[PDB]
């Protein structure tokens, strides 16, 4: 089930976002 | 200090263009029409597809209007 | 707070509801029954005299009431019972106070106006009313202020 | 009278105290973004978990590829943020070998072993990667994979051209013992004493 | 044993937006997906709980017979009233509702209005309309101003009057000794019981109904813990029961409203989760992902552009934008888009019917924006255009023919349209309390999209909901029961800690103490105590927490006492309430700005300095000058009549110019500046009020003059120099500009004739107008009979005459004046008092007999102004003259008590 969380989505608008497809355990 | 009223009169432009957004819409459109009609190594007859569609086709005497804000603005 | 208190209030109808505002403010707090400063035992034969069935709901609570509608018995008796230290409160109308056979330690005067009908308008107490009310604080061996 | 240089502004965040000095690194955030030293003095002067957790994400918002602000954001969350936010921090940080580190310390094993070979995958020329895997597969219920991992690690170290140093390995093998893993030390110290017969 | 505590430490700064959950799990079939700079988060329409099999719709001949006629064209019930029709009809029990939204909350209102309207049924009559009163508290003033209409409508067989709570403090007792169902904010209710207008009718107040108590979570929460904790508190003390019928959306902490409310869980408390909405809705969460926000600004175009086109043609759009200017910038730019794509003729196919009847109603049409948009499906919708074209968009969009209505949220509150998509555009208001732009409430955003779906025609509503991509969690939460209801009272504890202070429902700590344990801090704060900064040490070492709540009573009554609120010794806990506590309380304004109305107001203020003054409050805390709009700033600041003694980049010049070209009328530009202009003067009739009592009750008379003017000046919104024939609104603007030209004094205009006055003004079509308005305009024939009673002391017996004619339309059930009696220099107040002119005793003299001082420089005169408390521009003055006044001499002293020794009787 999708879980939103706040250190997640948080994390999520960081960075590129081509990258959050890396470090698997996604 | 002067830089700052041609600065707040092309935000003026674009908040009568585009509509009563917040402040960072407004000066993001400012970074973006200034360096987008710095950056076109004067290249002038294609302004009017990219910046009055970006600003809505308002018609091109407002073209003309905004030809003075990127003439206006220059360990 | 154990000493006999009289409040005068503008009107007839006016000192039955604060004889009951007085009491849900007491029973608003935990004391209740602080009005009351003898004991049920000894009402009885005071409370079955009277016609007014609220001022027995009053008076069981310690605070008795006075106006024009009340009956001479029962105005006597509630006189009685105040100027025994029976009960602490009694709430008199304004025109009583000339007639009342009763001092006390507090006398709180409520609103000293009253509705002129005949004018349309709340006329002030004449002082001289205020100044018998005020003249009702007045126990001379009792209590040492007023 | 010097804008546009950060060991002045953190000179001014020092010599204030601390919560006019809150406003000194205002004042050096607008005119030195992308400033990770001004924003790690930032989250020194606040004095509050929340403050400083505010402050730091700021500050990934504003340069998010910097190793030293992973390591200050999170240094203030407990585990499941923590690597919550260390995922991030390996997706931004990806040559950084101590959020790889700690990213496969606070994960469960079928995880960790994703990011050790993800870690594999970006940073090939570590040691530590390696000897972590070592830790993470003796940490766990598996004990014999453990030399299996390590004969596997200075065979591509010496593939892509690191020599085994003599010092360094034993030094692994001896922070390994006090870490509680010796097993992997043993091994790691048999192929160190190995490679470096009566001299 | 008390501890101060850091107050602003233990709030949530966000306000209305703290999250207290950190997670938020979706349902089921609830996929998101990062598409190109947006990421669309679907969550799924919810299938309706299945029935229980011995639960039915009962109809309404099955419920009690008094209760028949209030449910007109209703055959059935809902889902919803029908399990609990037994809850508010036949027992008393406080309830909480907490049903989606638009999933029939007020016809629950309605059950539980209807069993205290069932309780006065007078056998051979209808309704003992006298015995009782309801008031239905809902949270914004335009819902007020619909539900006014449907109880109206619902109970007008009941000959139940149903009335709003409006204008000053006379005319909102008026209208509830007038009415049944007073429908109001919680502030206006709160602001009532504060002033004290309900004081004589709350033994018939049986009934509140907290329509959306979800509000607990706003910044508008601590006046809904005031008014519940005032009347449960009220409860507990007076013992007359009021019943508490908290309707809600489905959030959490809902059982901590319950018990907020004194709702048992088991009788009173309904939870409904999103399943019980009517219309299920899919609903879609665009969070926009990029940090530029200009292509943020492109992207949500593209996105309305996109979802408009996915229910081009087959469903009506309801897009929701924040600003008026915004409604048709966007219905124009989604327009261009359109016939920019070449699929502007998705929404009107050859439907000729649908077209013609849109071509025919956009030529009728007045509102050129409007007119521009209507032959096509678009439409406007914002609360600035008129009357007759908004109720024409709203028919037009009721029978299908306007494809795209765009609208501000008011809409959405002030009418029960409902489309089958809603859109909401944007989620970021600029809100001038804070000064800024900020997120969308919970309140807006659960009711522009309870408008998702309509119950006659669709099976499913759609509401896109086009955010940010930080903020996508909140509504999330907020959409799914899962934002939890957080008290925000640690933010306004002072307050209504002086509030009731104020009304003597507290008197010293401990009555504060059992004050905060009736407020819905204090059960947040039992229930979570890490979020409301308790450890559980705390909790463990104080489980009633009882040194937490007199930590907060002291804090509060340090920031009262500090402020000159209170008088508050730490000896006994006892407080004293001081006048400004009184006018604080009584007009809303925070601790710090009477602290700056005590520090500030001299009696030597001019009108330059009042507007400074008022411009300080720390109500406009937050008002900052942006440099955007410091040009037009400027353009005000040459044209403001009264000088402005600071720079124009300072915020008080700000907020003092857009005073004052709110009074001028000067039209404005920028839509920050218009928006801080119209919360510096919806906040300016409190603040100029707050600042009026102060200064009449020190006794000051040039500065009462003063305010009590510039009340009247933003209530009425023209200067006084202007005529007073403005503040009879029906009055043509170019005649009345037409006498501001011939500048003659206004009082030479009651000597005319029709005739005469005609052709002063050289209007003679307009001279019986003007002699009629002149005479219904406010004046009182004064006359003094002074008495001199002491050497000190006169007795001023002022006959007060109206000479008007009263009217109703426009002085309404009474006049209110101020009679203010001054020394020579009009600069001490000797005796103010109130002067209510009641409609039935106009046209004869009122005795008004009161005493005022004379001191030993005996003055010339006193002054009697008998002012009007709403009117500009009424005023009689009439000199009490000393000019032969022969004073009593001073009387001889009075025979001593000589020490006699006391008589014994045998003398």
């Not at chain 4, 990806?94 to 580190?101: D, R």
């Not at chain 5, 809902?138 to 009335?163: C, D, H, N, W």
């Not at chain 5, 020190?698 to 009590?708: F, M, P, V």
Request: proline share 5%; glycine share 6%.
């Amino acid at each position: 089930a999708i879980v939103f969380n706040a250190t997640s989505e948080f994390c999520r608008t960081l960075g590129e976002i081509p990258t959050y497809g890396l470090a698997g355990n996604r | 200090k002067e830089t700052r009223e041609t600065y707040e009169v092309l935000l003026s432009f674009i908040q009568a263009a585009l509509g009563d957004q917040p402040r960072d819409i407004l000066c993001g459109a400012a970074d973006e029409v200034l360096a987008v009609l710095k950056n076109e190594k004067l290249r002038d007859k294609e302004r009017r597809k990219e910046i009055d569609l970006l600003l809505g086709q308002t018609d091109d005497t407002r073209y003309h209007v905004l030809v003075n804000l990127g003439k206006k603005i220059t360990i | 707070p154990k000493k006999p208190v009289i409040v005068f209030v503008p009107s007839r109808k006016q000192t039955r509801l604060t004889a009951i505002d007085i009491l849900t403010t007491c029973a608003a707090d935990i004391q209740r029954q602080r009005f009351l400063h003898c004991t049920e035992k000894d009402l009885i034969p005071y409370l079955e005299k009277l016609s007014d069935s609220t001022l027995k709901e009053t008076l069981l609570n310690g605070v008795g009431y006075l106006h024009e509608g009340l009956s001479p018995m029962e105005r006597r008796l509630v006189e009685q019972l105040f100027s025994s230290g029976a009960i602490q409160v009694v709430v008199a109308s304004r025109s009583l106070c000339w007639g009342m056979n009763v001092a006390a330690h507090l006398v709180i005067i409520m609103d000293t106006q009253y509705y002129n009908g005949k004018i349309h308008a709340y006329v002030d107490y004449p002082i001289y009313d205020v100044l018998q009310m005020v003249g009702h604080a007045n126990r001379p061996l009792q209590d040492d202020e007023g | 009278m010097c804008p546009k240089s950060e060991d002045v502004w953190l000179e001014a965040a020092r010599l204030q105290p601390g919560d006019t000095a809150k406003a000194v690194v205002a004042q050096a955030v607008r005119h030195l973004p992308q400033s990770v030293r001004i924003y790690i003095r930032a989250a020194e002067l606040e004095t509050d978990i929340r403050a400083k957790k505010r402050v730091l994400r700021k500050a990934l918002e504003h340069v998010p590829n910097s190793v030293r602000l992973w390591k200050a954001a999170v240094e203030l969350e407990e585990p499941e943020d923590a690597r919550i936010m260390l995922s991030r921090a390996v997706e931004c940080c990806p040559t950084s070998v101590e959020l790889w580190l700690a990213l496969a310390r606070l994960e469960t094993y079928e995880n960790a072993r994703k990011v050790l070979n993800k870690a594999r995958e970006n940073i090939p020329t570590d040691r530590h990667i390696w000897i972590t895997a070592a830790k993470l597969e003796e940490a766990n219920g598996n004990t014999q994979m453990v030399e299996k991992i390590i004969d596997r690690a200075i065979t591509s170290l010496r593939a892509n051209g690191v020599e085994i140093n003599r010092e360094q390995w034993i030094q692994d093998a001896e922070e390994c013992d006090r870490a509680g893993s010796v097993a992997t030390c043993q091994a790691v110290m048999r192929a160190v004493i190995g490679i470096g017969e009566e001299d | 044993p008390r501890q101060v505590l850091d107050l602003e430490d233990l709030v949530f700064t966000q306000g209305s937006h703290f999250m207290a959950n950190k997670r938020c799990q979706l349902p089921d079939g609830s996929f998101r997906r990062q598409r190109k700079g947006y990421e669309e988060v679907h969550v799924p329409a919810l299938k309706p709980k299945p029935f229980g099999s011995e639960e039915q719709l009962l109809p309404v001949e099955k419920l009690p017979k008094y209760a028949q006629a209030g449910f007109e064209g209703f055959k059935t019930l809902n889902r919803i009233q029908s399990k609990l029709y037994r809850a508010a009809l036949e027992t008393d029990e406080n309830l909480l509702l907490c049903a989606p939204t638009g999933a029939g909350k007020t016809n629950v209102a309605l059950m539980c209005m209807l069993r205290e309207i069932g309780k006065h049924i007078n056998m051979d009559g209808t309704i003992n309309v006298d015995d009782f009163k309801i008031i239905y508290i809902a949270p914004m003033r335009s819902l007020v101003q619909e539900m006014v209409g449907s109880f109206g409508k619902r109970l007008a067989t009941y000959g139940i009057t149903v009335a709003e709570l409006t204008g000053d403090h006379q005319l909102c007792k008026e209208e509830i000794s007038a009415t049944q169902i007073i429908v109001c904010t919680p502030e206006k209710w709160d602001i009532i019981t504060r002033k004290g207008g309900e004081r004589t009718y709350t033994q018939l107040v049986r009934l509140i109904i907290l329509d959306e108590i979800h509000l607990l979570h706003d910044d508008r929460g601590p006046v809904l813990e005031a008014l519940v904790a005032r009347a449960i508190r009220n409860i507990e003390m007076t013992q007359e029961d009021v019943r508490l019928i908290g309707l809600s959306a489905t959030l959490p902490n809902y059982e901590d409203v319950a018990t907020f409310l004194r709702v048992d869980p088991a009788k009173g408390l309904f939870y409904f989760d999103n399943s019980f909405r009517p219309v299920p809705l899919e609903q879609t969460y665009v969070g926009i992902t990029e940090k530029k926000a200009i292509k943020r600004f492109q992207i949500m175009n593209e996105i309305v552009y996109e979802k408009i086109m996915e229910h081009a043609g087959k469903n009506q759009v309801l897009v929701f934008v924040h600003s008026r200017k915004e409604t048709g910038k966007t219905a124009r730019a989604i327009r261009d888009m359109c016939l920019e794509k070449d699929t502007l003729g998705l929404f009107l196919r050859e439907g000729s019917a649908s077209t013609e009847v849109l071509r025919t109603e956009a030529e009728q049409c007045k509102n050129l924006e409007l007119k521009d948009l209507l032959p096509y499906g678009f439409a406007i919708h914002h609360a600035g255009m008129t009357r007759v074209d908004r109720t024409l968009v709203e028919d037009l969009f009721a029978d299908k023919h306007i494809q795209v209505l765009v609208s501000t949220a008011t809409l959405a509150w002030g009418v029960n349209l409902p489309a089958h998509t809603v859109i909401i555009k944007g989620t970021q208001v600029y809100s001038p309390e804070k000064g800024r732009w900020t997120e969308l409430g919970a309140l807006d955003i659960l009711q522009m999209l309870g408008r998702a779906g309509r119950p006659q025609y669709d099976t499913k509503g759609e509401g896109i909901l086009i955010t940010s991509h930080g903020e996508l969690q909140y509504y999330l939460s907020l959409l799914n029961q899962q934002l939890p209801i957080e008290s925000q009272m640690v933010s306004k504890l002072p307050d209504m800690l002086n509030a009731e202070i104020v009304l003597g429902n507290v008197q010293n700590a401990k009555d504060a103490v059992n004050w905060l344990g009736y407020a819905y801090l204090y059960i947040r704060m039992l229930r979570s105590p890490t979020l409301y900064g308790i450890s559980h040490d705390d909790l463990k070492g104080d489980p009633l927490l009882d040194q937490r709540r007199l930590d907060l009573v002291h804090t509060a009554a340090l920031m009262l006492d500090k402020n000159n609120l209170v008088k508050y010794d730490k000896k006994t806990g006892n407080f004293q309430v001081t006048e400004l506590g009184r006018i604080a309380s009584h007009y809303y304004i925070t601790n710090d700005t009477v602290q700056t109305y005590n520090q500030l107001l001299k009696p030597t203020l001019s009108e330059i300095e009042l507007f400074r003054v008022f411009s300080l409050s720390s109500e406009f805390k937050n008002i900052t000058v942006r440099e955007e709009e410091k040009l037009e700033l400027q353009k005000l600041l040459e044209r403001v009549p009264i000088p402005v003694k600071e720079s124009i980049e300072e915020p008080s010049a700000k907020i003092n110019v857009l005073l004052q070209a709110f009074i001028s009328q000067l039209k404005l530009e920028g839509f920050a500046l218009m928006a801080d202009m119209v919360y510096v003067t919806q906040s300016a009739g409190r603040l100029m009020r707050a600042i009026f009592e102060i200064v009449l009750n020190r006794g000051w008379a040039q500065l009462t003059d003063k305010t009590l003017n510039l009340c009247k000046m933003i209530d009425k919104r023209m200067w006084q120099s202007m005529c007073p024939l403005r503040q009879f609104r029906k009055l043509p603007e170019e005649v009345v500009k037409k006498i501001e030209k011939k500048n003659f004094p206004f009082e030479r205009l009651y000597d005319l004739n029709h005739n005469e006055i005609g052709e002063l003004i050289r209007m003679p079509k307009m001279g019986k107008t003007i002699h009629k308005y002149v005479h219904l305009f406010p004046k009182l024939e004064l006359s003094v009979h002074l008495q001199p009673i002491t050497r000190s002391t006169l007795k001023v017996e002022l006959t007060i005459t109206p000479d008007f004619q009263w009217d109703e339309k426009v002085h309404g059930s009474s006049e209110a004046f101020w009679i203010l009696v001054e020394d020579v220099d009009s600069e001490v107040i000797l005796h103010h008092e109130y002067f209510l002119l009641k409609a039935k005793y106009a046209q004869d003299e009122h005795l008004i007999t009161f005493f005022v001082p004379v001191f030993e420089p005996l003055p010339p005169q006193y002054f009697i102004r008998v002012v009007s408390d709403r009117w500009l521009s009424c005023e009689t003055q009439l000199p009490v003259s000393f000019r032969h006044l022969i004073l009593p001499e001073k009387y001889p002293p009075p025979t001593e008590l000589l020490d006699l020794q006391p008589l014994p009787v045998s003398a």
